[PDB]
Symmetry: D2
Subunit: 242 residues, 4 copies
């Protein structure tokens, strides 16, 4: 998270951290609980190469990384079959927890959007994670979950920005229909925030509008963060999650 | 270059090194002389972000990098407008030198393929450059130019290799029609070879079949090197080069 | 700490952590609480070059670095005037807390040894700290205070071992009278432990035999850890500390 | 070499480079040819720990590191038995070449000073080497041999300077009688220059005054470069070198 601050313990009960086995169980990507047995994440966090499920653990909503880990094994990794790179798209994946979750008050599921929700510019939107706090700067210990409010920008407004300072022909779409743009030179997600939730408050309900995907660096001039547009992939998601 | 050895002094008169300004004029990509005033290279060497011409130099064939240079300024940089990433395609660019070079037998142009050459599986193909000699292993001093013979692998055969150990649907194609596969687990190109030539002898003529473009690591099981297929951009090229 | 084990929450209430101001208040050395307003550490941690008090903080006994930080400012740094490098000796310094500590049960001073105690081989000694767990191998998150039981080795024998495999003349003393040796190839202190306490259990009471000073790497053959011999500088310490 | 400039090809024919075995024969220290079969260098380049002769080779006067290497094996390494660290002193060592050198106009010996030469301030002195061009800043390729003229300083003044902004007692010696100081905030030796020569032109003859030994950083205020004072070890040297 670039800009924004440390999150209150009550907010973002759906936030999860993904761990890879090493010298310690290290955070590498974010995620969200969308069902007591299912986590939504970014395909590039776990793909496109096939990886050992034993090497992976999920940690549910924690205020600081590592302090009180209760790591959770994973039974299935479902990566969207159109995915190969985040720029080509379909950067979305599903993890099946080995057991459904103890759904309390501090941890519970985020609500998915109706297929009809567009999230027009001006909607109140927040992204959260334990990623870098600027380009090439790790989040310092004790690793607090951070949050930032990011301004949404229309895909076409955003697409044109991406052509500023670029050789890429104007007729060539950089920001694709299954994507969504948000953030500015002061508010953004970054490396390590990947696969994490972008949530907007619509009529009093938090809906996950996006999954953190990619971008040209973090909070760079004319390079807003790019998210997987969740609505776009609702059918593929409901095919697997109850 | 992975595998392969130092190139003899006579071989590869069309090889060049691209140099970015810094504490010294550091090699970052390969390239080739295709006309006395034009250099062929990879788009991702010089894009998609727009570069400062003043910070770029061309160095014609040297046996050893940095020992002594005769850096040549560039007057234009043409990046294929379709390019955004190497995986999407169109990984190709042209550098116009500020002055034409005076060609000799130690430094002259490479011949481009006829507008329909095929390059079947097998076939004598060589790739050269000053890039890494393995995954995360720099070419050591005195930085000799390296060559390696690499077997072409048919596009369809190669695309199927690329789906092994991958989540990506067999209907989704990773190796595109503007791309070409070469190399194996012992013989391959690597970081810093990007933009350099893949050449094949055809009826006693060296033709440039490919530009070093990308791959999944270097010399990795079932992940041959990927090249921009030159034949596919002949028309584009000839719009700019006499 | 090489080898050993995470310290139990009720042990070593005199352990302190030294923090330097940066992107976060980072641990760089240990120290011990020997008086409610004084902390004992190594000179090489804070010298020989004079530093700014403002950029230094002290953290009292914590089970996990950084998590419940309550940084304490210091009003004075006193460094033994005979100190230039760890090898030459006099590697010992004092920090005056700006304010005295409210001695809890989880936080109290350690006892200094009487001038008469030489800590023979065979004594139950521990060294504790948050340093590296091996040569060039950081303590992983969440940074549990570690402890290791270390075998004391007599100076003359230790000094002789330091000559094994070295060019240095047997007549040249490497291990001085104001130093003390402890540890083997499975048990040792390391980088990040400097300044912390070596304590021994004598006649019911914990005495601080040593301050973590230097060595040739950590847990290397014929290279035991070197500590500053506390008894050697009692006068100096008592000049400042009631 | 900090400050300064590339050396002419005809200058300093006694300068050598020391190489350690690895992925390539990498420069790690300078030295100087004092006899057709003997190299003079710093002890901290080869000790205090004893190492494999096989792992070491010597390169004679060469303009650019690595370009036309003719590496010479070494038959014997003799380190001064008083050496333990540079700060303690006796930072001097001799390498015996396996076979004598064919001296010429481009490679020959430097002359050792008489016992009575103090090298007072005002003498014209140079240091040469392939070391860092500033703190944390490698000599860039093609790795030219460098030189810098450095002002000599008297010992008592050098010693006192080193106490400026240090905790060390004014009466505790930092710069010993076997050392010699030269340099300022603009001209100095650095990491990788170690062991190479410092020469002064006395009565029309170049003499070796010192051996690059140590210092606090490079070209830091009040921290001139510190050299092993060659006259001090003349008897030791003459015990091995005809
Ligand atoms: C021209 S396409 C292109 S961009 C890009 C790039 O600069 N990255 C650096 C920042 C990354 C994406 C990758 C790191 O993880 C996150 C998370 C959020 C955001 C949104 N603030 C941005 C990022 C690449 C890295 C390799 C290969 C092609 C790449
Ligand atoms: C899943 S698509 C994907 S692969 C890949 C990857 O593994 N790289 C490492 C090796 C690179 C390509 C990039 C480095 O330069 C050369 C040159 C030749 C070859 C042919 N041997 C291969 C390479 C990426 C790096 C960032 C963003 C998406 C990437
Ligand atoms: C021959 S004198 C000599 S040794 C040495 C060395 O190897 N270091 C690496 C390990 C260090 C000391 C320094 C790192 O901090 C701690 C803490 C405890 C221990 C005891 N387990 C050992 C160490 C030096 C480093 C520079 C300058 C002269 C040095
Ligand atoms: C307080 S004693 C102290 S200084 C110092 C330090 O700053 N170093 C960095 C610069 C070094 C000496 C070591 C690196 O190689 C050369 C060569 C020439 C010069 C002359 N400009 C200076 C240097 C140490 C490093 C470890 C252990 C005690 C050290």
């Amino acid at each position: 998270i670039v800009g924004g601050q440390e999150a209150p313990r009550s907010k973002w009960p759906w936030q999860v951290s993904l761990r890879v086995h090493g010298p310690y169980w290290m955070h590498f990507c974010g995620g969200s609980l969308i069902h007591p047995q299912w986590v939504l994440t970014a395909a590039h966090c776990v793909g496109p190469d096939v990886k050992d499920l034993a090497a992976l653990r999920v940690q549910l909503r924690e205020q600081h990384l590592y302090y009180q880990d209760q790591l959770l094994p994973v039974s299935r990794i479902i990566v969207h079959p159109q995915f190969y790179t985040a720029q080509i798209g379909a950067d979305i994946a599903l993890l099946e927890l080995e057991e459904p979750v103890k759904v309390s008050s501090h941890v519970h599921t985020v609500t998915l959007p109706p297929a009809s929700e567009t999230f027009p510019p001006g909607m109140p939107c927040w992204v959260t994670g334990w990623g870098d706090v600027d380009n090439d700067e790790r989040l310092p210990p004790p690793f607090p979950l951070k949050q930032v409010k990011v301004p949404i920008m229309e895909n076409h407004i955003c697409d044109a920005k991406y052509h500023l300072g670029a050789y890429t022909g104007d007729d060539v779409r950089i920001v694709r229909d299954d994507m969504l743009c948000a953030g500015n030179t002061r508010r953004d997600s970054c490396q390590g925030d990947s696969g994490g939730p972008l949530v907007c408050k619509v009529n009093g309900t938090w809906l996950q509008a996006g999954v953190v995907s990619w971008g040209e660096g973090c909070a760079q001039p004319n390079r807003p963060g790019i998210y997987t547009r969740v609505t776009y992939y609702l059918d593929w998601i409901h095919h697997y999650v109850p």
